[PDB]
């Protein structure tokens, strides 16, 4: 939510992209199509992982400890033992709460970052051959067939081939 | 149509999960994973730890030598399980600082006992009671020698036993508390007993107490249990005027990762590192809500029952 | 004028507030709030908890039955407040492991006492001392029975009391330590006393010690206080050759959320869920700097006296 | 972390008593100032909830250990003091780290919502205006009060003034 | 998190010994390199302070409990060992989490300062230049050494080259 | 021509550090610093803390008055150092609740002793033994008086000492345990001794116990060490029938930041605010991995041996 892409200028998520986490959708003369971007998906997954492993990694072996349940009242020592256990449990409960909240907030922010980074990169690729609507979609101003879209998705798009075509169609 | 359209977006799912962030409390994400283990199988796995089930016996009773606990002699364990149904069936007794004796025995992880040749001149040994039956005959705590008068006299006892080994010796002895003066004089000629157990660096002396007590297995008298540890190169001296419950040897005391746990769960054939009184639990998660008493490689105990961790973007379906 | 200007901006305030971030130590924000409570009203609110004020009495003295602590009989409390002006005005005494007895009485939260009909044959009862006055003449601790010789003989005592209820019983008994060997024989005949109090699972025996002690309210002797707990279905047996301060019954011991606190703050009519020795504090804030001793729903104690949490953007004036 | 406040915006308007973020325009009819309610409420809803997850009541404790002593005793008193001292220090660190972490995130998000509003206005005025390096937009067509209001609402149509603005631009 | 370093900048200039960030220009007179003090000092002022808030002395303890024992004792020793173990494990978690959180923010803030410099330059050269996708700018007019220094200073005027650059960009 | 190219970038270094982040575990940055101190200088610095080295003496033995510990009389310290080679060379003894007495002496920070004029009527004083030699003659613990029979009688002792100062007093006394009945009657006429030391609010009574104990420097007997504390305005009373190891005075007990530490590291002339048994460690870092026993301004103990904190951007080649 901190970069304004998901729940932002994208509006909605595509329920139906079973191939990846981020992808492209195009409307063309030949017909509409859909693809998935592995780089942004694998970058986000590799960040969600590692994050998981740092939390999950086992860090606790304890064998002999203090008694934590009692059947007879005794006084000072029992008061001390219970107070120690209560303090330990409360401190670890706070640590778990703060960890989960902090990790979840960063998880949302990095998914916006990857989406906004993909959008910005495509803007640089489509230098002056397209302009941006406020819906997360681009309007290409030249005849862009299926091989043309595949080149944009790959990153091998050449703007000089279609520059004068778009500039004429953009400005009178 | 001289123009095309290229749209960038992210996946949604028909069903999301609710997690908790810093700014919001209820926010839906595409995927999430649970971080708190809140269920127990109820079956205490017998691997990889060596779990010893003391059915009707406590650790102290097994150490002392209760006749119905004789199957536990020279045992060893990683976790000793004390069932709620255990009971005592020998001479009534109390242990001053009972918890400390139980804790150090449990941490030792062994009941290996070595008999030593004590010489008690002038007294009769191996006394027993009807409150502690070994089959049809009267008996007593094993590893423990009840000494009474021989004939009409009870001489002074002054015995020594050095530690010529390279490990600590754990000794267990006791003092008998009569209920009347006529009983105290009958068992021991001297009217007021005295027991002194000492090393080169520590001493313990007990005076027996006379008084009527509630009948436990037909006995109005009691016995108090004490322990002494002899370092290598040290020496043990026992001096007594009477009322002495002599030891029969020393317990080998080790340093290890053993302990004791109170539970009523059954033990099954399975594998689990973490043992709780509610049973064994897996340890693939960093936290657990089952029990604050644990043994082994366990998740840390927390108060919360659930903690969802986000593993995807926010879910925004329309 | 065929053009137009459109600017975007954020509010500023004439007076900001300084907060602490990670990258900076002194940064100004428009609004901020305080997370640490560093003041107390000084008035201990009497609601919603039940606060009992022991004016000149400690908990043990009220439990024992000091004549000037008699107004506290059969009392109950959520929090007992012990004033620093409290004093003892009865027979000099000491309690081995005093703190543990004080703690468990405080956690029980009640002083409900039930008198039981003990039978002490051959000895005189209801002893009193000039050190413990109840009005114009001698008296003793309530809930306790001083036993001395009847005529010229002090017989051996063997009394029993089973626990036929379904709740635990707490018994308070004592042993008297004379200052001279003559005082021992004058009250108990036998030259060496002995007290044994035991149950099916526990035992206690005390041998009195004869010797001079500091003179407190006219007495060179002392009394040692002991306690025993009898589970349901268990039985209590008291065997005494002499020097026995017999109990008059048992204390009903409960399990609850009661405690004890030492304070000199006055008690007023108000509502507060958190109590400290300095007084009552509100609990709207997560942390507090008043005292580390608290009772109730209280903010956690921290060393810092101030912690500002930003509630607005950075102030750029 | 986003520029914006203490950044490409330079200064903060002391005098916007209507909201947290807003617009100011210079027009042929005159100058004006308004406030944006979407971004202001979005921020307030984020500072709130942050406040509530911190303020939420916990720590109900009734009977504890003693923490003040009149007599020197030795082992047990030292243990009780060390337990209390360790607890107080750990919570004090928890309070300091929490405040510093939350305060940084509060600054970062307030930058985000201003940057988000700025880019939303930029995408509305597609080619009809261009970015002056101060957080202000120079609109290259005649834009009256109704025109400015349409921009603030989000119902601005670039096709109406595209050819007019393009002529004055290039 | 902002895409500048390990992103649309590709590589790092091993050889900028003057500052953390800077400019490299290709010109008719020749190539050159400079450094930006504002962003470098802003980042340095942020890594510092973070360092000082972590490095400040906090604890001064004199008399405590024993932590090593020569004889087995039981209950009290078990409590003392448990208390020390609980304390050490909690602080170790605090040290680990603190380092992970600060390092993540240090990486993020260095992207921000770089992305903020790039966005400032793009807003400064309004229509006289346009993006290239590698952190560089194609300036569509003649820009000598004094011209470049005016961009780095922030005293660049776009009207002096507006018509020249617009014609070179479009028809 | 007719164009130009302007590029924006960041520095790189020919060599980076591996640090740890939230998302990754191995990421390279230009600059980083260590936060965990994992080394000690091996030399305990004598500044600014006042370090006292008890070469062959433990704190209790120095307090008691062992003849080879006589050089430690009226000493003061900030940190007492106990060496592993320390031994005892006087009458064999044991201290019930040894650790607590060691704790309060160490925290008191001083061994300031004041001799008081006790009057022991009817008994001979200044006992000694071959087990505790002071030169060529038999001796005993200083600050301790061994009282035995005078002629053929051992009277009852009843002595008092008020606290007319405004600071607490610390009294160290003892009880003798003979090895045989014949030795008990030989030193003290009575066949069973008794020691009672009490104040207006406390009491302690010990009944000695006869029996052989291991040979320690020619003695099969033992001595038990106890302590009592008298508040200002309070009084001390000692009543003994025999076997009493009387005190010669009181220790002045203070409140301060003194402690004790067990180490075998040497002491040098240097300045260090933090002391560990391994030696003195610099405190320029927030965490340390040398030892969990510390004294002074010290980094917190952690299990990790290294924790790198990034101080530069990511290193990209
Ligand atoms: C109750 O029982 C205990 C033991 O069961 C008896 O205590 C023993 O008492 C004897 C003395 O009567 C002790 O023996 C003495 O040992 C000294 C050396 O001790 C050891 O340590 C050194 C190193 O420090 C070794 O070199 C040495 O070999 C020993 O192993 C000797 O120095 C003593 O001297 C004897 O010999 C010389 C002649 O050379 C004579 O002049 C002396 O008078 C003396 O006879 C002596 O050998 C023995 O150690 C004690 N044992 C314990 C365990 O304490 C009690 O006496 C007994 N009580 C009763 C009432 O019976
Ligand atoms: C002191 O008091 C205690 C308890 O008040 C007395 O203990 C009791 O002793 C009697 C024996 O006289 C026990 O009774 C026995 O019961 C069986 C039947 O179960 C019967 O067959 C025996 O012949 C005998 O009567 C009784 O259980 C026991 N109770 C307790 C609680 O210990 C004790 O005898 C008294 N001693 C003196 C000297 O008065
Ligand atoms: C053993 O010694 C103690 C003191 O060393 C003796 O106790 C003392 O007894 C006298 C009375 O005999 C007490 O005096 C009293 O003082 C009050 C005023 O405080 C006065 O009003 C009384 O009339 C009386 O005179 C004195 O306080 C007391 N001292 C202490 C410390 O207790 C004790 O008598 C001696 N015992 C034997 C057997 O000699
Ligand atoms: C609350 O009361 C406590 C008393 O227990 C105060 O703490 C004492 O304050 C005095 C005066 O500064 C110091 O000399 C003592 O050393 C303090 N004792 C302890 C144990 O800290 C405390 O300052 C009071 N706080 C408020 C807000 O009234
Ligand atoms: C990377 O290597 C450089 C050297 O190229 C290190 O920096 C300096 O190294 C010289 C020796 O070549 C020393 O005299 C300086 O004191 C060093 N300065 C600093 C600040 O370190 C640098 O430390 C190395 N960094 C890493 C991460 O290995
Ligand atoms: C690497 O970082 C350290 C800081 O962690 C730099 O050294 C610091 O320099 C300042 C003065 O500017 C001192 O106040 C600090 O005490 C120094 N700290 C340390 C650990 O040396 C160091 O110059 C940096 N080196 C490089 C090559 O970036
Ligand atoms: C979501 O997480 C679950 C584990 O809880 C896993 O089985 C599933 O494959 C994950 N799906 C995605 C799309 O990550
Ligand atoms: C585990 O057993 C304890 C009893 O000691 C009980 O309080 C707790 O609710 C149980 N939890 C589970 C998950 O079974
Ligand atoms: C600051 O925020 C609080 C709520 O967190 C509010 O009650 C208070 O009125 C605000 N003050 C100002 C000056 O905005
Ligand atoms: C410090 O000394 C302890 C022994 O008490 C030892 O275990 C540890 O390895 C030592 N550490 C260093 C850094 O010397």
- Burial state string for E60-84 with b = 16 or more CB within 10 A and e = fewer than 16: ebbbbbbbeeeebebbbbbbbbbbb
- F49: closest CA among F283, F263, F280, F282? F280
Q: Which residue of D has its CA nearest to B24?
A: D49
In 3-state terms, chain C is what percent helix, strand and coil (to 5)?
10, 40, 50
CA distance F73 to F63: 8
In whole angstroms, what is the distance from residue E110 CA to residue E1 CA? 10
Q: Whose CA is nearest to atom 13 of ligand 10?
A: F290
Instruction: Write the CATH number of the domain with boundaries F1-41+272-317.
Output: 2.10.77.10
Q: If phi over 0 gives left and psi between -120 and 50 gives alpha, with beta otherwise, what is residue D60?
A: beta
Instruction: Select from D50, D55, D59 the residue whose CB has the most chain B CBs within 10 Å, as the one to mutate to test that interface.
Output: D50
β-partners of residue C252 are C169
Ligand 7 mutation pick, B10, B29, B310, B311, max ligand atoms within 8 A of CB: B311
DSSP structural state of residue E15: T
Give strand pairing partners of D33: D24
Secondary structure of chain F as H, E, C letters: CCCEEEEEEEEECCCCEEECCCCCCCEEECCEEECEECCCCCCEEEECCCEEEECCCCHHHHHHCCHHHHHHCCCECCEEEECCCCCCCCCCEECCCHHHHHHHHHHHCECCEEECCCCCCCEECCCCEEEEEECCEEECCCCEEECEEECCECCCEEEEEECCCCCCEEEEEEEEECCCHHHHHHHCCCCCCEEEEECCCCEEEECCCCCCCCCECCECCEEEEEEEEECCCCEEEEEEEECEEEECEEEECCCCCCEEEECCCCEEEEECCEEECCEECCCCCCEECCCCCCEEECCEECCCCCCEEECCCECCC
Contact yes or no for F104 and D71 at CB 8 A = no
Neighbour order of strands in the sheet with F300-301? F36-37, F287-288, F300-301
B112 closest CA partner among B256, B275, B233, B294 = B256
Residue F217 structure tokens: 């420097």
Strand C148-149 vs strand C194-198: parallel, antiparallel, or unpaired?
unpaired
Select from F43, F278, F306 the residue to mutate for testing ligand 10; criterion: most ligand atoms less than 8 Å from CB: F278
Q: In chain C, how long is the greatest CA-to-CA distance? A: 127
* Calpha distance A84→A67 (Å, rounded): 11
Instruction: Collapse the DSSP code of D25 into the 3-class scheme (helix H, G, I; strand E, B; otherwise coil) and give the result.
Output: strand
Tokens of B62: 């097994």
**Exposure string for B237-267, b = 16+ CB within 10 A, e = fewer:** bbbbbbbbbbbbbbbbbeeeebbbbbbebeb
The pair phi, psi for residue D141, each rounded to 5°, is -130, 165
CATH of domain F50-260: 3.90.209.20
Pairing mode, if any, of strands F249-252 and F169-177? antiparallel
CA distance C257 to E49: 46
Residue D20, helix vs strand vs coil: coil
Among F7, F24, F39, residue whose Cα is nearest residue F281: F39
Q: Which of residues 89 through 128 in chain D touch C, CB cutoff 8 A?
A: 89, 91-92, 95-96, 99-104, 106-107, 110-111, 114, 117-118, 121, 125
Give the CATH fold of the E4-52+73-169 domain.
Hemagglutinin Ectodomain; Chain B (3.90.20)
Closest approach of chain E CAs to the CA of A128, in angstroms? 9
The shortest C-alpha distance from D78 to chain F (Å) reads: 8
Tell how far the Cα of B264 is from the centroid of ligand 8, in angstroms.
12
Q: Which residues line ligand 1 (CB under 6 A)?
A: B 158, 160, 235, 237; F 180, 212, 214-215, 220
* Nearest-5° Cα angle at D149, D147 to D152: 115
Question: In 3D, which of C135, C127, C153, C151 has the Cα closest to residue C244?
Answer: C127
What does the DSSP 8-state code read for residue C142?
A: T
CA F186 / ligand 1 centre spacing (Å): 22
CB F237 within 8 A of CB C214: yes
DSSP C185-236: HHHHSSSS-EEEEE-SS-EEEE---------BTTBS-EEEEEEEEE-TT-EE
Is the CB of A147 inside 8 Å of chain C's CB atoms? no
Structure tokens belonging to residue E59: 């604890």
Check: CB of residue A107 under 8 Å from CB of residue C135.
no
Largest CA distance in chain D: 92
B23 touches chain D (CB under 8 A): yes
Q: How many CB atoms lie within 10 A of CB B187?
A: 18
- Among candidates B8, B285, B297 on the partner chain, residue whose Cβ is nearest the Cβ of A136: B8
Task: Work out whether strand F274-276 and strand B259-262 pair parallel, antiparallel, or are unpaired.
Answer: unpaired
Q: Which residues contact C238 (CB under 8 A, 6 or more apart)?
A: C157, C158, C159, C160, C173, C195, C196, C197, C244, C246
Q: Which two tokens stand for residue D11?
A: 């200064």
Distance of CA D112 to the CA centre of its chain: 7
CA distance readout (Å), B298 to A148, B124, B131, B257, C255: 56, 53, 44, 15, 32
Residue A161 DSSP symbol: G
As a whole number of Å, the end-to-end CA separation of chain A is 38
The three-point CA angle B239-B244-B250 to 5° equals 80
Sequence-distant (6+) residues with CB within 8 A of B292 are A68, A85, A89, B301
Chain B, window 68-87: residues with a beta carbon less than 8 angstroms from a chain F beta carbon: none
Could you tell me if D35 and D25 are in contact, meaning their C-beta atoms sit under 8 angstroms apart? no
Q: Are F216 and F90 in contact (CB under 8 A)?
A: no
Of the listed ligands, the closest to the CA of B41 is 8
Q: Establish if A2 touches chain B: CB-CB under 8 angstroms.
A: no
| Alpha-carbon torsion (B177, B179, B180, B182), positive or negative | negative
Surface of C (170-209) touching B: CB under 8 A: 194, 196, 198-203, 205, 207
- D136/F156 Cα distance (integer angstroms): 103
Among chain E residues, CA nearest to B105: E74
Question: For residues C181 and C178, what is the distance between their CA atoms, to the nearest angstrom?
Answer: 7
**How many other C-beta atoms lie within 10 A of the C-beta of residue C115?**
10
Cβ neighbour number for residue F26 with a 10 Å cutoff: 9
Q: For residues D76 and C7, what is the distance between their CA atoms, to the nearest angstrom?
A: 68
How many Å apart are CA B74 and CA A23, to the nearest integer? 69
Whether F231 contacts F237, CB under 8 Å: no
Q: Does domain C17-41+272-310 have CATH number 2.10.77.10?
A: yes
Residue located nearest, by CA, to atom 10 of ligand 3: C215
- C6–D139 C-beta distance less than 8 A: yes
Angle between helices E75-124 and E37-55 (to 10 degrees): 170
3-state helix, strand, coil in chain D (%, to 5): 55, 15, 35
Q: Does domain B1-41+272-318 have CATH number 3.30.465.10?
A: no
Instruction: Map residue A138 onto helix, strand or coil.
Output: strand
SS (H, E, C) chain B: CCCEEEEEEEEECCCCEEECCCCCCCEEECCEEECEECCCCCCEEEECCCEEEECCCCHHHHHHCCHHHHHHCCCECCEEEECCCCCCCCCCCECCCHHHHHHHHHHHCECCEEECCCCCCCEECCCCEEEEEECCEEECCCCEEECEEECCECCCEEEEEECCCCCCEEEEEEEEECCCHHHHHHHCCCCCCEEEEECCCCEEEECCCCCCCCCECCECCEEEEEEEEECCCCEEEEEEEECEEEECEEEECCCCCCEEEECCCCEEEEECCEEECCEEECCCCCEECCCCCCEEECCEECCCCCCEEECCCECCCC
Q: How far apart are CA C288 and CA D95, in angstroms?
A: 11
CA nearest to C237 within chain B: B213
Length reported for chain F: 317
User: What SS3 class is residue C151?
Assistant: coil
Q: Cα–Cα distance between A31 and F274 in angstroms, integer?
A: 75
- Entry resolution in angstroms? 3.0
**With 0-12 CB in 10 A as exposed, 13-18 as middle and 19+ as buried, what is F41?**
middle
Residue among F15, F17, F308, F315 to mutate when testing ligand 5 (max atoms within 8 A of CB): F15
Looking at all shown ligands, the one closest to residue B32's CA atom is: 7
CB C59 within 8 A of CB C104: no
**CA–CA separation, B245 and D5 (whole Å):** 84
Residues of B in contact with D105 (CB under 8 A): 22
Does B198 contact ligand 7 (Cβ within 6 A)?
no
**Which residues of chain B neighbour D102 with C-beta distances below 8 Å?**
22
Distance (Å) from the C-alpha of residue F175 to the closest C-alpha of chain B?
A: 13
Give the residue, by CA position, lying nearest to ligand 1 atom 43: F218
Closest CA to E136 of E151, E146, E150: E151
Cα dihedral C57, C60, C62, C64 sign: negative
Task: Give the phi and the psi of residue F134 in degrees, each rounded to 5.
Answer: -115, 85
Instruction: State CA C118 to chain mean position distance.
Output: 28
The CA distance from D120 to C218, in Å, is 92
* Ligand approaching nearest to the C-alpha of E67: 10
E25 CB-near residues (< 8 Å, 6+ apart): E31, E32, E143, E148, F4, F5, F6, F7
How many other C-beta atoms lie within 10 A of the C-beta of residue C53? 16
Share of chain A residues as helix, strand and coil, in percent rounded to the nearest 5: 55, 15, 35
Q: State the pairing for strand pair C137-139/C129-134.
A: antiparallel
In angstroms, the CA D101 to CA E133 distance is: 34
| Stretch (H or E) spanning E21 | strand E21-26
Between CA B65 and CA B74, with CA B69 as vertex, the angle to 5 degrees is 65
Going by C-alpha positions, the residue among B84, B213, B67, B78 that lies closest to residue B129 is B67
Q: Count the residues in chain B.
A: 318
Closest C-alpha residue for ligand 1 atom 16:
F215
Coil vs helix vs strand at D59: coil
Helix pair angle (E75-124, A76-125), 10° resolution: 20
CA atoms within 13 A on the CB side of F239: 19
Q: What is the DSSP string of D89-111?
A: HHHHHHHHHHHHHHHHHHHHHHH
- Is the peptide bond between F235 and the residue preceding it cis, with omega within 30 degrees of 0? no
For D128, phi then psi, to 5°, come to: -85, -5
Residue C86: both structure tokens together: 């409290």
Q: Tokens in use for A104?
A: 């979840």
β-sheet bridge partners, residue F7:
E24, E136
Contact B5, A130 (CB under 8 A): no
Give the whole-angstrom CA distance, residue D28 versus residue C3: 8
CA dist list (Å): C212 to C140, C209, E76, F189, F237: 21, 10, 35, 20, 8
Closest CA to B292 of B280, B282, B277: B277
Neighbours of A159 (CB within 10 A): 14
Orientation angle between helical segments D37-55 and D75-124, nearest 10 degrees? 170
Listed by start position, the domains of chain B span 1-41+272-318, 50-260
Question: Cβ(B114)–Cβ(B154) under 8 Å?
Answer: no
Q: Does D53 touch chain B (CB under 8 A)?
A: yes
Q: What gap in Å lies between CA F68 and CA F141, rounded to an integer?
A: 10
Cis peptide before C48 (omega within 30 of 0): yes
- C interface mutation test: which of B214, B217, B224, B225 has the most C CBs within 10 A? B214
Residues D94-106 as b or e (16 or more Cβ within 10 Å = b): bbbbbbbbbbbbb
Segments making up each domain of chain E, as ranges = 4-52+73-169
* Total CB pairs under 8 A between chain D and F: 19
Structure-determination technique? X-ray
With 0-12 / 13-18 / 19 or more C-beta atoms within 10 angstroms meaning exposed / middle / buried, residue F61 is: buried
Q: List all residues 6 or more positions away from C186 whose beta carbon is below 8 Å from its beta carbon.
A: none
User: Do B248 and B144 contact (CB within 8 A), yes or no?
Assistant: yes
Alpha helices in chain C (DSSP H): 59-64, 98-108, 181-188
- For residue D166, list chain E residues with Cβ-Cβ distance below 8 A: none
Tell me, what DSSP letter sits at residue A79?
H
Pairing between β-strand C222-230 and β-strand C93-94 as defined by DSSP bridges: parallel
Q: Which residues contact B289 (CB under 8 A, 6 or more apart)?
A: B36, B37, B38, B301, B302, B303, B304, B305
Of A64, A121, A171, the CB nearest to E8: A121
CB E24 within 8 A of CB E148: no
Inspect the interface and report whether the beta carbons of D62 and C294 lie closer than 8 Å: no
Of B172, B175, B171, B173, residue with least CA distance to B235: B171
**Residue A103 contacts residue A51 (beta carbons within 8 Å):** yes
**Element housing A132 (H / E):** strand A130-132
How far, in Å, CA of C4 to CA of C9, rounded?
17
What is the rounded distance in angstroms from the CA atom of residue D81 to the CA atom of residue D89?
Answer: 12
Here the tokens at position C12 are 């500023």
F216 Cβ under 8 Å from any chain B Cβ? yes
In the block, tokens 């919502």 appear at: D113
């Amino acid at each position: 939510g901190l970069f304004g892409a998901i729940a932002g200028f994208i509006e909605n998520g595509w329920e139906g992209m079973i191939d990846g986490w981020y992808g492209f959708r195009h409307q063309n003369s030949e017909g509409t199509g859909q693809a998935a971007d592995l780089k942004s998906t694998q970058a986000a997954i590799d960040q969600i992982n590692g994050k998981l492993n740092r939390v999950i990694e086992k860090t606790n072996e304890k064998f002999h400890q203090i008694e934590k349940e009692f059947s007879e009242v005794e006084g000072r020592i029992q008061d001390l033992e219970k107070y120690v256990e209560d303090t330990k449990v409360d401190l670890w409960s706070y640590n778990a709460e703060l960890l989960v909240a902090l990790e979840n907030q960063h998880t949302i922010d990095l998914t916006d970052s990857e989406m906004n980074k993909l959008f910005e990169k495509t803007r640089r690729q489509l230098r002056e051959n397209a302009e941006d609507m406020g819906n997360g979609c681009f309007k290409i101003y030249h005849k862009c067939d299926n091989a043309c879209i595949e080149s944009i998705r790959n990153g091998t798009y050449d703007h000089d081939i279609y520059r004068d075509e778009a500039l004429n169609n953009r400005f009178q | 149509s001289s123009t095309a359209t290229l749209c960038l977006g992210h996946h949604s799912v028909p069903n999301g999960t609710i997690v908790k962030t810093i700014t919001d409390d209820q926010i839906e994400v595409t995927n999430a994973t649970e971080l708190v283990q809140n269920s127990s199988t109820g079956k205490i796995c017998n691997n990889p730890h060596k779990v010893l089930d003391g059915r009707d016996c406590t650790l102290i009773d097994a150490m002392l030598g209760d006749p119905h606990c004789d199957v536990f002699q020279d045992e060893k364990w990683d976790l000793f399980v004390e069932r709620s149904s255990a009971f005592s069936n020998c001479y009534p007794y109390d242990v001053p600082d009972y918890a400390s004796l139980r804790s150090l025995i449990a941490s030792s992880g062994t009941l290996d006992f070595i008999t030593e040749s004590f010489t008690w001149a002038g007294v009769s040994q191996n006394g027993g009671s009807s409150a502690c039956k070994r089959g049809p005959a009267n008996g007593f705590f094993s590893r423990l020698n009840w000494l009474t008068k021989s004939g009409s006299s009870y001489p002074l006892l002054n015995v020594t036993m050095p530690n010529n080994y390279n490990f600590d010796k754990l000794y267990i002895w006791g003092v008998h508390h009569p209920s009347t003066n006529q009983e105290q004089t009958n068992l021991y000629v001297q009217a007021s007993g005295r027991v002194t157990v000492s090393t080169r660096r520590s001493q313990q002396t007990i005076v027996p107490n006379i008084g009527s007590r509630p009948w436990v297995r037909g006995q109005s008298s009691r016995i108090s249990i004490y322990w002494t540890i002899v370092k290598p190169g040290d020496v043990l001296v026992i001096n007594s005027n009477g009322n002495l419950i002599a030891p029969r040897g020393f317990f080998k005391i080790r340093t290890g990762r053993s302990s004791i746990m109170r539970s009523d769960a059954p033990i099954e054939t399975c594998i689990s590192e973490c043992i709780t009184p509610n049973g064994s639990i897996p340890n693939d998660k960093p936290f657990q809500n089952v029990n604050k008493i644990t043994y082994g490689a366990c998740p840390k105990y927390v108060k919360q029952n659930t903690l969802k961790l986000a593993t995807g973007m926010r879910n925004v379906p329309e």
